[PDB]
Amino acid sequence: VDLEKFVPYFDTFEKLAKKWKSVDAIKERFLEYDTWYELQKAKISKQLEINNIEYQEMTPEQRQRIEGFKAGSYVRIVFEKVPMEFVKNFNPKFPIVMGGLLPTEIKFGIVKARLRRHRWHKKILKTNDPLVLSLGWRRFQTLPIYTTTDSRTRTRMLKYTPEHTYCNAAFYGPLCSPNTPFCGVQIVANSDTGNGFRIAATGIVEEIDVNIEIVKKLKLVGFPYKIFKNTAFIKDMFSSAMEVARFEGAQIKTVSGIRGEIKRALSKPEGHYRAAFEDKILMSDIVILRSWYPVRVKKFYNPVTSLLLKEKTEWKGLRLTGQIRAAMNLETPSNPDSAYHKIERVERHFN
Amino acid sequence: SPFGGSSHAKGIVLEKLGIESKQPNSAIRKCVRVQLIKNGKKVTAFVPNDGCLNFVDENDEVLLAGFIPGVRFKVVKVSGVSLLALWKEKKEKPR
């Protein structure tokens, strides 16, 4: 009556025992292709030859019920809750294409793809930068985050796409089966087409799930102020001694590369701590602690819906970080310290 | 002869056995299991480098040529395009 009872219903002992005084009524049940390629093709063909046979055996009404509407059939499809503007802004020149969606296509979430800057695209792409992708039948805009494996130890957030290679990209949108490739474009409107190659990236979707654990690297920096050989004291690394208490024993290193440890926090002043190094450091050294902070994917989804517009060729969505700065007249941010300068080394003479 | 008289043999890329390796450009990271189409025998093949490993994907046509000792075959050619052409940014793989 119900499947939760795994053992199914049976008759009583005595009837069943009388039913099988003899073992009669069951005696019946009891006791070359040249190439492997030809074998696979035949397996496909036989299944196809099997398929054709039942459908012929089936009634035409039965056939359509089971197979549906086969390709080549001229068919009428009626839709309801279509947008108002679609009929009004209808241009027969622009094609209307319909595509069936498998169950994975309806689902929304994070998409992991191995993606590269398109080779003829002039500029490298940036993380957190809008990009119009073409997945399956659907073409929509998202904000992808470009990442690397760091020798398959963690997923580290890259700031741009590599110049001439692929990298892992995470973005949010309708899902798809793995191994479904795609193409990316930054500009689709005719107004901003210019003379650059418009295809920005080309890649393969790698995996599907509901979240990613992208992390970004953080370096907390410190300066020394007092040194005894291997041991030294460092300041402004932390604002309070309680902060130092958390990172006691943490591995630290200088720009020169002299590795160190956070031995103990100094009571006076707040934030100062004692560290021991493999060698004496110099006053000009800067000590650094390597750390990592989680990053999140923005859940942005803006389907690109040109056919619903009057123009059908001037659709526009999120603007690139370059364009917003140009429109609001903001200079590209820069730091004088971050800038690189020529260095000439004076030979040192020791006493 | 390794291919039974032919100079080249096509196969089917089944799975990249070296993807999980930590060390970049390890000898393992360039190893790919391949099904020889003419007889269906599974074999292992070399891809020139981890950069070229990006180009190869599962269920693509791959041509194999004679070359982690024992992997005698190298992937010279994939899916209508040669790898070195793809690797030099001279071509895109057709899909």
Binding site: Y37, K43, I44 | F3, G5, S7, I37, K38, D60
Partner: peptide, 19 residues
Amino acid sequence: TMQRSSDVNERKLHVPMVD
């Protein structure tokens, strides 16, 4: 000729697909 026939037999091979 056998080496050629091997070279022409191999180029006929492809991935099995269903149309």
